[PDB]
């Protein structure tokens, strides 16, 4: 439970810092201080309107690629098996498959910011 003890201590020590930084250093709020910041002026009124991406295409490819790397994390242990021959081909095959998918997306536009 040693990891639990340091985890508990860490989140505790963080909580004291926010605790005495909210009660000790005075309190005075009169609305316009409490208002959002828009570089000096009053916002158009939102911060909740759809802030549509312009790079949505690459986001999903990250999920496919961040997923597939989890398939090759076992590589250090995969090297120390009695069958490195098929290990070499299969592990290589994954890297070309990611390479092909990146190459496929690259050629058909893709990574460049969708406009």
């Amino acid at each position: 439970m040693n990891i639990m003890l340091t985890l508990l201590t860490n989140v505790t020590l963080a909580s004291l810092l926010v605790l005495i930084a909210f009660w000790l250093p005075q309190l005075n709020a009169y609305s316009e201080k409490t208002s959002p910041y828009e570089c000096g002026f009053d916002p158009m009124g939102s911060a909740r309107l759809p802030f549509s991406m312009k790079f949505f295409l690459v986001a999903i490819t990250f999920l496919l690629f961040d997923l597939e790397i989890a398939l090759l994390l076992p590589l250090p242990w995969a090297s120390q098996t009695n069958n490195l021959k098929t290990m070499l081909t299969m592990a290589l095959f994954l890297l070309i498959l990611l390479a092909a998918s990146l190459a496929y997306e690259w050629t058909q536009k893709g990574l460049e910011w969708a406009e």
């Binding site: 759809p50 949505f56 999903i60 999920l63 496919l64 997923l67 398939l71």
Partner: protein
């Protein structure tokens, strides 16, 4: 054991959550995504318990396709959000006939 009960009722409310749309598809899509987390934890619990070395395979490989299902899922939601603007399932009825 009791740990198994906790995580199969994790499926049940996830099952209830998925096929219960209130306002928007994104919340249900996330529930579909999180539904496999119980599925991951479920399958993972037997496999380390039973010491079956090979079948440690499938928790990772279930993760390949469950999140891939989500990958095409929220990318489908992109096509909705351009024609539909919002992501509401209540509006998602233009094929009323």
């Amino acid at each position: 054991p009791l740990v198994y009960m906790n995580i199969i009722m994790a499926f049940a409310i996830a099952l209830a959550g998925l096929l219960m749309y209130r306002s928007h598809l994104m919340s249900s899509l996330l529930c579909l995504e999180g539904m496999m987390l119980s599925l991951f934890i479920m399958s993972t619990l037997i496999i380390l318990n039973t010491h079956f070395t090979l079948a440690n395979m499938m928790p990772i490989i279930l993760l390949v396709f469950a999140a891939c299902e989500a990958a095409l899922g929220l990318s489908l939601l992109v096509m909705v959000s351009n024609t539909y603007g919002t992501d509401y399932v209540q509006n998602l009825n233009l094929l009323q006939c």
